[PDB]
């Protein structure tokens, strides 16, 4: 097994969720917001 | 034109920048990487 690419699934949905709330809640800062969202995602899953 | 607000630009570049390093650094945790990357961003621009 050598000479191939591996794209892990899950980045298409995780990004779609952020693109949603951002264009819906319209936060004052996307940077700081991106930290509050993903950081909270840790508790969401599992 | 008509309406009021539309898809704001600037989010496409911020995402492409992440999708890049994420595929290169291939970290074992994208959630922890997104929180460590964005959080460090605010400290970069200063």
């Amino acid at each position: 097994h050598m000479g191939h690419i591996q794209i892990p699934p899950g980045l298409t949905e995780l990004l779609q969720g952020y693109t949603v709330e951002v264009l819906r809640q319209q936060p004052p800062d996307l940077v700081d917001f991106a930290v509050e969202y993903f950081t909270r995602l840790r508790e969401a899953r599992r | 034109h008509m309406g009021h607000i539309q898809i704001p630009p600037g989010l496409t570049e911020l995402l492409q920048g992440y999708t890049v390093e994420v595929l290169r650094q291939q970290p074992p945790d994208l959630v922890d990487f997104a929180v460590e990357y964005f959080t460090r961003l605010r400290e970069a621009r200063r």
């Binding site: 690419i5 990004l15 779609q16 693109t19 | 995402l15 999708t19 890049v20 595929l23």
Partner: peptide, 22 residues
């Protein structure tokens, strides 16, 4: 719409990166 702009949004991001970073 909005879901249509984000959908292809991820497609253009993947291409402009692995294509020799072009």
């Amino acid at each position: 719409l909005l879901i249509e702009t984000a959908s292809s949004l991820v497609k253009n991001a993947i291409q402009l990166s692995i294509e020799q970073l072009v």
